[PDB]
Chains A and B, each alone.
Chain A
Amino acid sequence: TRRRTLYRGDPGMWSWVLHRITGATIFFFLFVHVLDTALVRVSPQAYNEVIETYKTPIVGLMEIGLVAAVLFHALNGIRVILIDFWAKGPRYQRQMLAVIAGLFLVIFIAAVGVIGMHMVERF
């Protein structure tokens, strides 16, 4: 028997689950992408072939998704490092969390705007 139920606890819990998910995302991408970059010790034409197949609109929205993942992971990791090293850290947990929510929204709407204007002028 296995019951299925949602705990509905702190917001730091959802921060941690997003942290874990985005970290694993970047790890798998990094494996694949170090390979395709290692294709540069083979041929300029091989490298150009591959990275040109990386210039499609699907891969563009995926670039936006990966930008989001790395940005959230970086901000939340700063929060975690602060909690651990700063002695008054655990008191301002939720303050830091709201601050990095704000920073993420700002920087990410800016980054989507820039990447979007590039994708627009490229079509």
Chain B
Amino acid sequence: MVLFFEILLVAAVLVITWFAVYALYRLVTDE
């Protein structure tokens, strides 16, 4: 039960980090 919410926390951190690096990647790539 608590495990569900710590799983949710790490999933949120992964989505946050992915979005940060993806925004920077789309900024620097020439397409």
| A106 on interface, CB distance cutoff 8 Å | no
Interface of chain B, main secondary structure: helix
Please count how many residues in chain A sit with their CB below 8 Å of the partner chain's CB atoms: 24
B17 vs chain A, min Cβ distance (A): 9
Taking a contact as CB atoms under 8 Å apart, the answer to whether A4 and B30 are in contact is yes
Contact B30 A3 (CB under 8 A): yes
Interface contact B12-A28, CB-CB below 8 Å:
yes
Given the interface contacts A2-B29, A5-B30, does A36 sit within 8 Å of B23 by beta carbon? no
What residues of chain B lie closer than 8 Å to A17, measured between beta carbons?
23-24, 27
Q: Give Cα distance in the complex from A49 to B4, angstroms.
A: 12
Taking CB as reference atom, which chain A residue is nearest B6? A53
